[PDB]
Amino acid sequence: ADPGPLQDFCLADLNSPLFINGYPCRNPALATSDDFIYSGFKQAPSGFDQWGLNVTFVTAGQFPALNTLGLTINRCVLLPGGSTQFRTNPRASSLVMATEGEILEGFYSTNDNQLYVKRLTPGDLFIIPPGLMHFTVNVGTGNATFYASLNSQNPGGQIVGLM
Template structure:
C-alpha cells in the first residue's frame, strides 16, 4: 500500500510540474533575422506575425531543370516558410526533365513521403541493415515513403517530364547529396580513392564536373 501511494504521489506531482512549467503556445513563426540553431529558429515577436507568415507561394512555379542532373527541387522549409518553424512539418517540390535524377542523398533530420503528380519515377532507398534495396516504378498518384537518414534516389524513367511533391516530419530535414559529399570537396584525390576504392582518374573527372579540388 505504501509503495502504491508513493507512486500515486509521484505521478500527481509529475503532472502538476509539467502543467505548471510546460510552455504552451499556438505557433513559433521563425525569426529569420536571427541564427538558426539545432531546434530551429527563435520565435518572431507575436505582435509582428501576419497571415503571410502562414502562406507560401514558392511551390507553384516549375523549377529550372537545365542543369547536370536535369532536375530542380524547390523547398518550403522553415527558412523559406517561417510558419512551419517548430511545427514538425515541411514540403518540397521536385521537377525532373526526361532522364532527370535526384541523386542518392539523405535527410538526417526527417522522414520523407512522396506523391507523384505527373510522369513516371523509379525511386528507392537502401537500408542500413545488410544494405537491402527497396525500389519501385511509381506512376501518377502513387505514394512512397523514405525512412529518416537512409540513402534514397528518384529517377525520371518516363519519356515526359515528372513532377512530385514531398512532405517531411521536420521543418528542416537537412540534405546531403552523396555525389557532392564525395566529389565536391577539397580532400586529396588519393584519400578519396583510398576511402571509396574508386579509380583515381574517375575521381578526378567527377571532381572536375562537380567542382571539387585536391
C-alpha cells in the same frame, strides 16, 4: 524528432542576429493571415542541376510559419533522363507523392543495403525511413514531378553517391 511547440506558432525571424536550435521568432502578436500561406510553388523551376533535378524547398528557412511545427514539403522536378543521384534526408522521414510523369523511387536499408524500389505514377505514395540512402530516376516521358513531405522543419539534404 523536432522539438515540440510551446505555443500556437512562432514565425522564424530570419534576419535575427541570434543563432539557436531552429530559429528565434518574431512577436506572435504581429502575425497576420498572410504569414501562414506560402506561394513559392507558383514559380516554376528556374533551372536544373547537372543531373536534371530541380528542388523547390519549403523549410522554415523559406516559410517562417513552419518554425516549431515539425513539417516540410519539397517539390522535385526531373527533366527527361534526370535523376537525384543517391541522397539522404538526415533528420526526417520522407513521404513522396508522384504527381506528374513516372519515376523509379527506392531506398536502401541498413541491412546490407537491401534495396526497396518501385515504379511510381501520379497518385502513388512511397515512404523513405529517416536518414536512409534513396534515389529517384525519371523513367517516363517529359518531366516528372513529385512532392516530398518530411517530418521536420529542416530535414537537411546530402548527396551521398553519384550513379
